[PDB]
Amino acid sequence: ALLSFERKYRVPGGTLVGGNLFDFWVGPFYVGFFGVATFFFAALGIILIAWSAVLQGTWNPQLISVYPPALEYGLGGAPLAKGGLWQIITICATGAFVSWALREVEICRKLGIGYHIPFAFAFAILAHLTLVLFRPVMMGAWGYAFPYGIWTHLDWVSNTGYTYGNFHYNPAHMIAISFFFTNALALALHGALVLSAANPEKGKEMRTPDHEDTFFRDLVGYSIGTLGIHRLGLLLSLSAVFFSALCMIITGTIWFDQWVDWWQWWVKLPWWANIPGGING
Amino acid sequence: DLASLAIYSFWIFLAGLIYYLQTENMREGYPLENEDGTPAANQGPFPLPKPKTFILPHGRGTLTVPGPESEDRPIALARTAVSEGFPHAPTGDPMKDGVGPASWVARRDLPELDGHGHNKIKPMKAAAGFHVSAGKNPIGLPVRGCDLEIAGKVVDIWVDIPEQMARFLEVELKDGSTRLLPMQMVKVQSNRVHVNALSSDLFAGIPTIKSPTEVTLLEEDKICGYVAGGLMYAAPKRKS
Amino acid sequence: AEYQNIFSQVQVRGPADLGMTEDVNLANRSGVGPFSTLLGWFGNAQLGPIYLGSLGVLSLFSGLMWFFTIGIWFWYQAGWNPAVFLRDLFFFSLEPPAPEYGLSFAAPLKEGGLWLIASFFMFVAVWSWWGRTYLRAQALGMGKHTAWAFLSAIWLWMVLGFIRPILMGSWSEAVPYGIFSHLDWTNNFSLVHGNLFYNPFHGLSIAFLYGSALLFAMHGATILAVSRFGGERELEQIADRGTAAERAALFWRWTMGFNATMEGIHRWAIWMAVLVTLTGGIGILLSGTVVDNWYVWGQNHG
Ligand code: BCL
Ligand code: BCL
Ligand code: BCL
Ligand code: BCL
Ligand SMILES: CC[C@H]1c2cc3[nH]c4c(c3C)C(=O)[C@H](C(=O)OC)c4c3nc(cc4[nH]c(cc(n2)[C@@H]1C)c(C(C)=O)c4C)[C@@H](C)[C@@H]3CCC(=O)OC/C=C(\C)CCC[C@@H](C)CCC[C@@H](C)CCCC(C)C
Ligand SMILES: CC[C@H]1c2cc3[nH]c4c(c3C)C(=O)[C@H](C(=O)OC)c4c3nc(cc4[nH]c(cc(n2)[C@@H]1C)c(C(C)=O)c4C)[C@@H](C)[C@@H]3CCC(=O)OC/C=C(\C)CCC[C@@H](C)CCC[C@@H](C)CCCC(C)C
Ligand SMILES: COC(C)(C)C(=O)C/C=C(\C)CC/C=C(\C)CC/C=C(\C)CCCC/C(C)=C/CC[C@@H](C)CC/C=C(\C)CCC=C(C)C
Ligand SMILES: CCCCCCCCCCCC[N+](C)(C)[O-]
Ligand SMILES: CCCCCCCCCCCC[N+](C)(C)[O-]
Ligand SMILES: CCCCCCCCCCCC[N+](C)(C)[O-]
Ligand SMILES: CCCCCCCCCCCC[N+](C)(C)[O-]
Ligand SMILES: [Fe+3]
DSSP: OBOTTOGGGOOSOOOSSSTTTTOOEETTEEOHHHHHHHHHHHHHHHHHHHHHHHTTSOOOTTTOOBOOOOGGGTTSOOOGGGTHHHHHHHHHHHHHHHHHHHHHHHHHHHHTOOSHHHHHHHHHHHHHHIIIIIHHHHHTOGGGSOOBSTTHHHHHHHHHHHBTBOGGGOHHHHHHHHHHHHHHHHHHHHHHHHHHHHSOSTTOOOOOHHHHHHHHHHHHSBOOOHHHHHHHHHHHHHHHHHHHHHHHHTBTTTBOSOHHHHTHHHHTOHHHHTOOSSSOO | OHHHHHHHHHHHHHHHHHHHHHHHTTSSSOSOBOTTSSBOSOOOSOOOOOOEEEEOSTTOOEEEESOOOOOOSOOOEEESSSSTTSOEEESSOHHHHTOGGGOOOOOOSSOOBOTTSSBSEEEGGGSTTOEEEESOOOTTOEEEETTSOEEEEEEEEEEETTTTEEEEEEEEOTTSOEEEEEGGGOEEOSSOEEESSOOGGGSTTSOOOSSTTOOOHHHHHHHHHHHHHHHHHTGGGOOO | OOOOSSSOSOEEEOSOOOOOOTTOOGGGBOOOOOBOTTGGGTSOOBBOOOBOOHHHHHHHHHHHHHHHHHHHHHHHHTTTOHHHHHHTTTTOOBOOOOGGGTTOSOSOGGGTHHHHHHHHHHHHHHHHHHHHHHHHHHHTTOOSHHHHHHHHHHHHHHIIIIIHHHHHTOGGGSOOBSHHHHHHHHHHHHHHTTOGGGOHHHHHHHHHHHHHHHHHHHHHHHHHHTGGGTTTOHHHHHHSOOHHHHHHHHHHHHHHSOOOOTTHHHHHHHHHHHHHHHHHHHHHHHBTTTBSOHHHHHHSOO
C-alpha cells in the first residue's frame, strides 16, 4: 500500500475545506473533501447514464448515447428522457472535473509542490465548458452541444464541421492543429533525447545533459535546454487547447458562413485585388 | 480481412506495450510496503522487471534497479490512527526533521558533475566568464521573508555552468554566515528579493553546506526540502 | 504571486559552450552562433554551433531544392508578379501527375514532372536527415531513440507520398505541395474513403495525438512543479532519485492511483508520441488498398 519512500510525505495538512475530516487515503488514493465531491458527482453521473441507457434501449457501449435537448427546447430544462438526463449529467461531469482539479490542488499543498498540474488541467476543463456550456449558451440552446456516446459524438464533430464547409479553413483551428502536431513532435524528441542519454550505446557510461545540449546543437544548431523543453511541452499543449476552444467559441457566433470564404479578406486587399493572373484573377 | 488482422494485432501489441511500460516504471519505490516498512501482501498484478544497470560517469560507480530499497535516514513521524491510510504526525519540528513537505532524500553527498567532470553548480564569483546577462541582478538586494522582515542580503548567484542558468541565491545572514535559496522559490523585485516560503526567523534553520564553494546532491535536497516545507509550516507567520 | 518558472527572472551567461567531443569530428562544427537574450527568457540563449558534414550538406541542399522547385512553380502560376505571388500564396499548388500516367516518369514538367522532381529532392532531404539523426547520436555515444522515433514520422510521410501511391498504381494519389491544396486533399481523402472517423487506426491516431498533449501537459507541469527541487535534472534524478522525483511520483499516485519513474515517464512519452504516426500510417496505407470505405468496413467488423 505505500511506495518504499512514501511514508515521510503522508503528513496532515494541505486541505482546502474540512480541516482533518477527509484527510486520509484509500490504498494509493488521497481523498480529501474534493475526493468525496468527485466520487459523488461521478457516481451520480454514471448512474444517470445507466438510467438514460434504459430509457433509450441498450447496454451496448458502442450504442449508448445521451443526447442533449433538441433545439426546440432552447436553453430551458427538458424532460429527462428527452434531454434532461443530458443536462444533469453535464452538471455532474463539470462538478467532477472541477472537484478533481481542486483535489489536485490539495495534493500539491501537502507535497509542497507548485500548482502547475491543476492549472494545466483547467485548460482541458475550459475546452469542455466551451463545447457544453459557453458555445451552446451564446448560440441559444443546449442542442448545439455534443452528445455523450462513443460514436455519436464523432458524428456531431463531422456534422458540426461540415456546417461551415471544410473546417480546415477556420484559422484558429489551423493554429490549434499546428500546436497539436508540434507538441507531439516535441514529446517524441523529449522522450527520445532523455532515453538516448540514459541508455547509451552498450557498455558506455550514462550521458549528461551536456551531451543532450550537444546532440541538438549538432543536429539543428540549437538546443532549448532541460528547463526549456518542459516549459515548451507545457506551452505547446495548453496553446493547442486554448486555440481549440477559441476556434469553436467563434464558430456559429461571430462567424457562421463557410470558413473557406473568410480568407477572401486577404485576396481582396485593394493593392492587389484586381491585378490579373494567378489563381484569383 | 487484412485490416481486421491489423487492428486485432495492434490491440495485442498495445496490451504488451502497456505491460512493458508499467513494469519499467516499477524500477523505483517497489515492492510496496505497509506503513511500518515491511512488504505489503498485495503487490498488484505486474511483477518487478529484470534489473538493469546504469554506468555512472567519473568513477561514480553504478546503479542497479530494481534493488533493495531503503530510506537510509530516520523518519520522525508517528501514526495518528489504529488502521492503515491515515496521516502520520511529526514527532518534533517537521522543518528540522525533514518530513512532510519539508522532506529530503538521502541523495549522495557528492556534487553533481558536468560532462567534463567539473562541479556542475558553482558560485558565480568562481565561475570564470559568468555574469548576469539580462534581468535585474539580485546580487546586493535585501532579502525579505513572508513576515515582511529582512532576513539577509544576496551576496552571489550559484549558477549551473554547463546549462548556463541561475540555480540558487546565496544569502548572507545577520551573523555573517550564508545560506542557499532555490532560484524557483524567490521573487526578484527592483528593491528586494522576496521569499514567500520562509519567515525571517526561519532563515537560520536552512541547512548549511559543508564547503563554501560547492553543494552536494544531499545538501541541495535538504535545502530545497526545507524551503518548500515553509509553505505549510511557516504559515502561522505568513500574511499576504 | 509565487514565481511560476515559466520564464526566467535572471539570465546568466558564460563562455560560449562548444559542447562535448566524444567521437565527433570537430572539423565539421561551425563556430558558435550569436546569443539571443530573447530566447534566454524561456530556453537557452546560445545559438550553434551546428555540425554540417557531408550528409548534412546533401540534406540541406535537396531540402532547399525541394523548396525552390515548388516556389519556382508558384512564381510561374503567379505570372512572375510579386503582388499576385503574395496575394495567392496559399492557393498555388504543385500537383502530381494525372492518373493516366500511372507510376511513370512520362508526364510533362508542367503537369506532374515538376512534382516528381520536387519529391525526389524531398525524399533525399529527409532520408539523409534521418541518417544524420542516427550519426550525430553515434558520434556522441548515445542511444538511437531519436532516429527510431523520427522513423515513425517518416513512416506516415512515406505512406502518403510513396508507398500508398505505388500500391495504388499512380502518383496521382500523392499529396500536392500547397498550403490550401493539401488541406483539400486531406478532406477529399476522407470523403472518398467513406469517412476516416470510422478508420479504427484513425481513431487510435487521434487518441495518441490528444494523449500526447495530455501527457506533455502532465509531464511539463509536473517537472515545473518540482523544479524547486531540481526536478528538471532528470538524468541525475534517474541515477540518484531525489525528493523532486519522489514528490512528482506521489502527486500522481495520490491523484490517480499509480505513477511513473523519472526514467519511465520518458518511455510513456516517446511511445504516446510515436504511436500517433505509426497507427496513422497504417490507417492511411490500408485505405483504398484493402478498404475502400470505412463506414462499410465498420458495418462488417463491429
Ligand atoms: C496530417 C494530414 C495531412 C495534413 C493535414 C494538415 C492539417 C489539417 C493542417 C496542417 C497544417 C500544416 N501542415 Mg499539413 N498535413 C499533412 C502533411 C504535411 C506535411 C508533410 C511533409 O507530410 C507537411 C510539411 C505539412 C505542413 C503543414 C504546415 C503548413 C502546417 C503546420 C504543420 C506543423 O505544425 O508541423 C510541425 C511543426 C513544426 C514547427 C515543424 C516545422 C514547421 C514548418 C512551418 C513546416 C512547414 C513548411 C512548409 C514548406 C510551408 C512554408 C511555405 C510558405 C513560405 C508559407 N503537412 C497530411 C497530408 N496539415 C495546419 C495548417 O496550418 O495548414 C495551413 C493545419 O490546420
Ligand atoms: C469533419 C470534421 C472537421 C473538424 C471539425 C472539428 C470540430 C467540430 C471540432 C474540431 C476540434 C478539433 N479539431 Mg478539427 N476537424 C477536422 C479536421 C481536423 C484535423 C485533421 C488532421 O484533419 C485535426 C488534426 C483536427 C484537430 C482538431 C483540434 C484543434 C480540436 C480537437 C482537440 C480539442 O478540442 O481538445 C480539447 C479537449 C477536450 C474537450 C477534452 C476535455 C476532457 C475533460 C476535461 C475530462 C475528461 C474526463 C473523462 C470523462 C474521463 C473519465 C474516466 C477516466 C479515463 C478514468 N481537426 C475536419 C475538417 N474539429 C474540436 C475543438 O476545437 O473543440 C474545442 C471541435 O469541436
Ligand atoms: C476533443 C474534440 C471532440 C472529440 C473528438 C474526438 C475524435 C475526433 C475522436 C475522439 C476519440 C475519443 N474521444 Mg472524443 N471528442 C470530444 C470530447 C471528448 C470527451 C469529453 C468529456 O469532452 C471525452 C471523455 C472523449 C473521449 C473520447 C474517447 C472515447 C476517444 C479517445 C480519446 C482520447 O484518448 O483522448 C486522450 C486521452 C487519453 C489517452 C486518456 C484516456 C481517456 C479515456 C480513453 C476516456 C474514456 C471515456 C469513456 C469511454 C466515456 C466516459 C467514461 C465513463 C462514463 C466515466 N471525447 C470533443 C467533442 N474524440 C477518438 C475515438 O476513437 O472515438 C471513437 C477519435 O477519433
Ligand atoms: C475532413 C478531414 C478528415 C481527416 C482526414 C485525415 C487524413 C487524410 C489523415 C488524417 C490524419 C490524422 N488526423 Mg484526421 N481527419 C479528420 C478529423 C480529424 C480530427 C478531428 C477532431 O476532427 C482530428 C483531431 C484528427 C487528427 C488526425 C491525426 C491523429 C492524424 C495525423 C497525425 C500527424 O501527426 O500528422 C502530422 C505528421 C506528419 C504528416 C508526418 C510528417 C513527417 C515528415 C518527415 C516531415 C517532413 C518535414 C518537411 C521536410 C518540411 C521541413 C520544413 C522545416 C521547417 C525544416 N483528424 C476528418 C475526418 N486525417 C493522418 C492520418 O494518419 O490518418 C490516419 C492522415 O493522413
Ligand atoms: C489541456 C491539455 C490536455 C489535457 C491536460 C490534462 N488532462 C488531465 C490533466 C491535465 C493537466 C490532469 O491532471 C488530469 C489527470 O488526472 O490526468 C491523469 C487530466 C485528465 N484528463 C482526462 C481525460 C482527457 N483529457 C483530454 C485532453 C486533454 N487533457 C488536453 C489535450 C481528453 C481528450 C483529448 O478527449 C480526455 C478524454 C482524464 C484522464 C483526467 C481527468 C479525470 C477526472 O476528471 O476524473 C474525475 C471524473 C471522473 C472519474 C469521471 C466523470 C464521469 C461522469 C461525470 C460522466 C461522463 C461525462 C461525459 C462528458 C462522458 C463523455 C463520453 C464520451 C464518449 C464523449
Ligand atoms: C512521432 C510523430 C511526430 C514527429 C516526430 C519527429 N519529427 C522529427 C523527428 C522526430 C522524432 C526528428 O528527429 C527530426 C528532427 O530533426 O527534429 C528536430 C524531425 C523533423 N520533423 C520535421 C517536421 C515535421 N514533423 C511533423 C510531425 C511529427 N514529427 C509527428 C507529429 C510535421 C507535421 C506535423 O506536419 C512536420 C512539418 C522537421 C523539423 C524534422 C525533419 C527535418 C528534415 O527532414 O529536413 C529535411 C529538409 C531540410 C534539411 C531542408 C529544407 C529547408 C526548407 C524547407 C526551407 C527552410 C525554411 C523556410 C521557411 C525559411 C528559409 C528559406 C529562405 C532561403 C527563403
Ligand atoms: C520567395 O520565393 C522563392 C523562389 C525564393 C521561394 O523559394 C519560395 C518557396 C515557396 C513559396 C515554397 C512553398 C512550399 C510549400 C507551400 C510546400 C508545402 C508542402 C506541404 C504542405 C507538404 C504536405 C505533404 C507532403 C508529402 C506527404 C510528401 C510525401 C513526399 C515523399 C514521400 C516523396 C516520395 C518521392 C517520390 C514520389 C520520388 C519518386 C522517384 C524516385 C526516383 C524515388
Ligand atoms: C503479448 C506480446 C505482444 C508484443 C508486445 C511487445 C511490446 C514491446 C515494446 C518494446 C520494448 C522496447 N525494447 C525493450 C525493445 O527496447
Ligand atoms: C492509457 C494508460 C493507462 C495505463 C494504465 C496502467 C496502470 C496500471 C496501474 C498499476 C499500479 C499498481 N500499483 C499501485 C500496485 O502499483
Ligand atoms: C501509451 C499509452 C496508451 C493509451 C491508449 C488509449 C486508447 C484509447 C481508445 C481509442 C478507441 C479506438 N477505436 C479504434 C476502438 O475506436
Ligand atoms: C481507462 C483508464 C483505466 C483506469 C486506470 C487506473 C488504475 C488505478 C489502479 C489503482 C490501484 C489500487 N490497488 C488497490 C489495486 O492497488
Ligand atoms: Fe522530462
